[PDB]
């Protein structure tokens, strides 16, 4: 019921206590998913599950500043499975984004972009059927 890629506006940016919830299902034979928290053309937080990087499943996280990718943060805990429904929750905390998948903590990503109130869009893309994308204050 949502079209991918999907853009979710984050009015006034993000702030600590904001909880973003994404519900969807991974397609069969998926190759990738991506969440991109944007500050204009900059990517404050890219969260990128990769289903076949050299026959390994990995989650890659990074920031893009002035069109340049920085230092990648990689996690080999990989909770996604092709064909299966998922829930991604991203909780903004003071020093990091905190990510849980299917109610299990996955990773944290330290704020590199510091102007949280300018991170005003979330792009959701990749090999998913997207069911809902929303936010609340915790
Ligand atoms: C595929 O469709 C897309 C649509 C829209 C946007 C994007 C963006 O993809 C980009 C984004 O995910 C970025 C995050 O760091 O990594 C880019 O890929 C990176 C490799 O991950 C990055 N790969 C690795 O470092 C690597 C590979 C295997 C194991 C390992 O362990 C440390 C590391 C590669 N680095 C080098 C030196 O080639 O440089 C590429 C270009 O910057 C993606 O092209 C892709």
UniProtKB/Swiss-Prot annotation:
Keyword rRNA processing attached: no
Domain of life of the source: Eukaryota
GO molecular function annotations of the record: carbohydrate binding; chemoattractant activity; disaccharide binding; IgE binding; laminin binding; molecular condensate scaffold activity; protein phosphatase binding; protein phosphatase inhibitor activity
Motif interval(s): Nuclear export signal: 114-129
Tissue expression pattern: A major expression is found in the colonic epithelium. It is also abundant in the activated macrophages. Expressed in fetal membranes.
Keyword tags: Acetylation, Cytoplasm, Differentiation, Disulfide bond, IgE-binding protein, Immunity, Innate immunity, Lectin, mRNA processing, mRNA splicing, Nucleus, Phosphoprotein, Repeat, Secreted, Spliceosome
Residues the record lists as Phosphoserine modifications: 76
Name recorded for this polypeptide: Galectin-3
Name of the gene: LGALS3
Known role: Galactose-specific lectin which binds IgE. May mediate with the alpha-3, beta-1 integrin the stimulation by CSPG4 of endothelial cells migration. Together with DMBT1, required for terminal differentiation of columnar epithelial cells during early embryogenesis. In the nucleus: acts as a pre-mRNA splicing factor. Involved in acute inflammatory responses including neutrophil activation and adhesion, chemoattraction of monocytes macrophages, opsonization of apoptotic neutrophils, and activation of mast cells.
Keyword Disulfide bond: yes
């Amino acid at each position: 019921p949502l079209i991918v890629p999907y853009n979710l506006p984050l009015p006034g940016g993000v702030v600590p206590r904001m909880l973003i919830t994404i519900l969807g299902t991974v397609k069969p034979n998926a190759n990738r998913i991506a969440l991109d928290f944007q500050r204009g053309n900059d990517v404050a937080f890219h969260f990128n599950p990769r289903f076949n990087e050299n026959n390994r499943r990995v989650i890659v996280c990074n920031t893009k500043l002035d069109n340049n990718w920085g230092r990648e943060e990689r996690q080999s805990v990989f909770p996604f499975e092709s064909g299966k429904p998922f829930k991604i929750q991203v909780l903004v905390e003071p020093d990091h984004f905190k990510v849980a998948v299917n109610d299990a903590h996955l990773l944290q990503y330290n704020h590199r972009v510091k102007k949280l109130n300018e991170i005003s869009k979330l792009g959701i893309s990749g090999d998913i059927d997207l069911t809902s994308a929303s936010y609340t204050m915790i």
